[PDB]
Amino acid sequence: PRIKKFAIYRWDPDKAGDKPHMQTYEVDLNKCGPMVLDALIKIKNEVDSTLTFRRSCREGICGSCAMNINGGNTLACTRRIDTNLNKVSKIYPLPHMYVIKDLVPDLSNFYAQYKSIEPYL
Amino acid sequence: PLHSIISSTESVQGSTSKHEFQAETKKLLDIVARSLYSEKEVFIRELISNASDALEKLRHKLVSDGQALPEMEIHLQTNAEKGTITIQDTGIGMTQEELVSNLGTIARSGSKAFLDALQNQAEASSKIIGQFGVGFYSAFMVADRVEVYSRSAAPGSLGYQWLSDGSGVFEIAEASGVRTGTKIIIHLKSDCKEFSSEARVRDVVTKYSNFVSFPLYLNGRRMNTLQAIWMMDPKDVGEWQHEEFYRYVAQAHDKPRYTLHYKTDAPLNIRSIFYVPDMKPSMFDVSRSSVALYSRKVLIQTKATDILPKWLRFIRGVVDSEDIPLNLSRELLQESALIRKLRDVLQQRLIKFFIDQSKKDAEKYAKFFEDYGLFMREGIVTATEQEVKEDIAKLLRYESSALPSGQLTSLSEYASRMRAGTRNIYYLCAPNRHLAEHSPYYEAMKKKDTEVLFCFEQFDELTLLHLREFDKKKLISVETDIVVDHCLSEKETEELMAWMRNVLGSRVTNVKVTLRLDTHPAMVTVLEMGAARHFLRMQTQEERAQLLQPTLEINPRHALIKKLNQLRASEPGLAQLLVDQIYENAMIAAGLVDDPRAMVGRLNELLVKALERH
Amino acid sequence: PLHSIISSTESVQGSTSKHEFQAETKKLLDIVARSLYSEKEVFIRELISNASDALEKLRHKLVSDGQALPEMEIHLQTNAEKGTITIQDTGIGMTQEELVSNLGTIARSGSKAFLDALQNQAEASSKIIGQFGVGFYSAFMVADRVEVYSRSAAPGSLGYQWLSDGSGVFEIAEASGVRTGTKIIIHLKSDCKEFSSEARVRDVVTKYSNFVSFPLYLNGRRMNTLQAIWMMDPKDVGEWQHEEFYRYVAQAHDKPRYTLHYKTDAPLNIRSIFYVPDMKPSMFDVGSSVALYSRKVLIQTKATDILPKWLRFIRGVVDSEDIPLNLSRELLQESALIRKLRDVLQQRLIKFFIDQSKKDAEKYAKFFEDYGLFMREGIVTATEQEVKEDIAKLLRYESSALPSGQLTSLSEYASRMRAGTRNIYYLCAPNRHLAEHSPYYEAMKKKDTEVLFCFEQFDELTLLHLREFDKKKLISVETDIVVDHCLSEKETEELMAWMRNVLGSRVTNVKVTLRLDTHPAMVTVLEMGAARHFLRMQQLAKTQLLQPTLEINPRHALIKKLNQLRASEPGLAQLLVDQIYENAMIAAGLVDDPRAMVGRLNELLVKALERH
Ligand SMILES: Nc1ncnc2c1ncn2[C@@H]1O[C@H](COP(=O)(O)OP(=O)(O)NP(=O)(O)O)[C@@H](O)[C@H]1O
Ligand SMILES: Nc1ncnc2c1ncn2[C@@H]1O[C@H](COP(=O)(O)OP(=O)(O)NP(=O)(O)O)[C@@H](O)[C@H]1O
Ligand code: FES
Ligand SMILES: [K+]
Ligand SMILES: [K+]
Ligand SMILES: [Mg+2]
Ligand SMILES: [Mg+2]
Hints:
heterotrimer; A: alpha+beta; Ubiquitin-like (UB roll); 5-stranded mixed β-sheet; 15% helix; elongated; B: alpha/beta; Heat Shock Protein 90; 8-stranded mixed β-sheet; 4-stranded mixed β-sheet; 37% helix; binds phosphoaminophosphonic acid-adenylate ester; binds FE2/S2 (inorganic) cluster; binds potassium ion; binds magnesium ion; unfolded protein binding (chain C)
């Protein structure tokens, strides 16, 4: 019995009042792939499908499997899972890289900025 | 804590009765005149609509028997001395019975009976505005006494009088000398005297009823002088008419570079015309829809529903639709399925029109793109469905390395002419084409034999990440591709790298050696470079390094690195300054600098303490 | 010319009759059910408002009688199998005559008649919602038939059954077993069966009338659990339910750093509460969850903007019993009362922020670096001057005469300024370290006049648009320099002529200023802030250049090196002067995308180091 402790960052934009919070996931290493990407897929199909990740070739060619672990940016489908029982993996997204990709910035009040320019010019 | 008092114990015990619905006329008048219309100036719009409806009814009546058609005009009269505004029309008019049944009954419109009596619903059904029956009572908003002179167009009708103060009681009488048609005199309220002036009435009419089907005269002078060119076929309207209409609608003195005349009926009756300004967009265009609705040739004045997608706000024009649902205030019914389908149809039609224009002409569309690219970029960013994403992305034009300078290329043709065995599209961001051709990332990518698009405008890679896909082909930047993909002596290189990492341990988290670079001594690579560049603009150096991990990647073959190899011992301080400077240069080349003012001082120090030996 | 057909020749000879205005009910019902309410979901909101009005009337009658108060609550029943929604209240109820008078007459409301019998207009006028008389008929938007079982609260009234198919005809009958109050049965339409689902009904009720003054139960479960805290006195309400109310209204789980409770009646009745989040604002924020209320029911304007656009970082609720409303229970667009309410709210919020700054320096400083961009945007978008100074009173800057870490406002900056000076100087740099070492600050360092240091973006444009504060102008350091009135003269003349020859396209004018000690070069333009921000506009988007002047430092060693290095390496000299110009442009902030300078810098570094 080799229970692996995974600490995965989670943030659901659609959740009501979601705030950054920490969760711990326990996955047995005897029935899971050594690679980090296998553990993410395992919880998606069995434990919880809320977590979203991008994987296409599970080999290291598309680069969609690259995230940060222990403060270091790595690749899940290449780097394996640490076998230390006492040590817990720090599963984090890319350094900050939050939902900004889907925040849809507005940048409103743009004309009023110009309206404040021509009196000086 | 789950208790309810709902039960079905109730049942009928006596004989059922029967009743008819009633209506409190006084409260209905108060509601119409006080809490129905946001703007107090819509009463003349309603009266002009009624006059147009009456004139259309008279025209239909005189065409049914095929007799002569007399003059048909709507006259606005302003009497500042008496504080009254007079509306007169030469339409059908109304008899005593018609005056009592129509004017005296709330929510009773003679247009509905007229429409039901058409037996065709194809000639005047599209030219009658009145559908509720409360438009006339909007005059009571500003009038303490309404006087109506009406006589029918029948051969032998008598003039009639109609007075009402809006207090739920109206008195009728017989009048003499009244011209055929209907004349309504409005005695303005004490606080509503602004409508007894030329300028205010002219402004409101130009806001609402420029495009009525009949000539409109204000104080004796015609003020329309412009027909609605969005009604007839596109072949029947000339280029001069298009230019004049664009000048009117856009409030600009230039000409429209693109003209679209959309007239569809299978999804819904739409008569819409759109223009693209010749001049570059202004800051008002990029700030929130510049398209005016016109149901039965009268303004709807939504200004908030955004019948057109926000990114398409750069175009100017009008949209005609007789099927849009209007509330009692003659305003668009918010959150309507019909208006949403209208918006979708207009968006897809405009996308198809832009694609067809791009196919037809190359230089004109290139100018249009270099003028209005930010709007399509915002549309790609703000889109949700992948279908509209691809439709808007079909409008993009990016010049690539496989083509000479000044030759913009589309995404579709790039995908068509590239390798069919790889689902990858490569794009590079640089201020200029020359910079892109000499960018360190492009040079590192030169090992691969593939074509790469070049992006110059801001918020371009942002749209590339939002699109994320095109024709089942992924969008990968050059920096992301090279970071994902995996002179000096060996020991000398190792000690040099160790020294640089020692003096850049906090700022740089990893340094590697790459032989792909040829003209750049160093290069900073981040996995999500496109996302990181935009993230930096919204969120000193230590924090940025921690949240970015600027993984350095130097080129030993560069002469600068070779010089630093021996400067590390003779001038350790100058070597530290130079390694800081090259790190800053690589960061700038990556676009990962929020403000380059900080490095100016250390660059000046390096310059003064470096070339002093000359 | 003029073609006029208006004439006064008409005359009246016939007898003047007299008629009463009529109103056909078929078209009125059609208009209400089709072309009155934009949202199909407002019918239960109207029914809940009617139930609340009935319960308020019963409460008023009972307190007038001064007897025991039985339980009063609103019950909502949803039956998916039957496709029906049932709303029941324990209010006064309606007799057969009352049912005919109210239900059967359009625009006839018993609420107005009850209010006319109040004679105080304060006991229940602030809680009665019904004012038009068409709220019930909104139920016909989704119902092909409506059953109403209402029994009056009078001791002896009989229950009555009310039927109406919405076709302009309704029938009434005697009903047995009906409990005191009013029970309404709605049979949903074929295409509007989504209202027979518990989830949708619960969501829309929480959207509209979850602040109803009386308990509301849907399918036996109450979801109010939270009184409308904006009605009670600020001293009565405590911070714990302030946090709860914030967490509900803002849809967040943090605490509000600021809580403002506004309750005034002299200009207009306002019962509003505002909050400021602890967390930094999200880019989505950059009606802001400050949706207006009236008699404890939602209005969802989103168009009048009762609260200023820049004041969108605050969350809360605004209540006003005197706001005009549409027939569809929506705000009158561009209403004078709405505009005056917005102005009053903005003034009160500005005063509250000023008071918070006065009573807590460090908390307000944290708030300013948390929400400064909103005040900057407010200054930029403002039109009235007094609004500009009112918002500018909220600005916090750190000056050159104070240590790092503390910030000051413009008012207390001008308070300590010299009497002779009548202008305010501000310098823009990313950090205070750069600002103290900025060449413009060093050039102005000759005088002892204090200068403010602003670091955040848009500070240049904000100060330019402000342009005045307490009758004192705002002049940037670069503007003051440009408006102000070892390299011997001959060699200096030859060397600036060299720049003029080799930088004529870029540098229009070259001059020597003796006010530089550490920076070899300076770039100064008249519209420094305006040009700097307009260049960012132009580079950000290709839409609808400038006159740069470069000044060299005679005593700088780098500049002095040109005298001996021009005669040795002309090409290296040209490259070095180009790099000096680029560095001066970067320091001025007028530089374009600096990716182009990297190649020139690398070439200069590799070429100029062939001596060690
Ligand atoms: N100037 C007029 N000349 C002739 N008939 C008129 C005139 N004004 C009103 N009417 C008639 O009186 C009816 C009542 O006026 P109105 O309230 O405007 O109804 P409507 O215009 O048909 N519907 P609405 O969209 O609310 O205006 C109209 O439907 C016409 O039949
Ligand atoms: N559940 C009820 N119990 C008792 N009286 C009711 C109930 N529902 C409606 N009424 C009465 O019937 C009248 C007609 O309803 P309604 O159309 O809502 O008028 P209103 O609510 O007073 N004005 P409005 O704001 O348009 O709803 C109300 O004014 C009440 O007097
Ligand atoms: S799945 Fe393709 S890089 Fe890992
Ligand atoms: K009417
Ligand atoms: K009623
Ligand atoms: Mg009309
Ligand atoms: Mg009501």
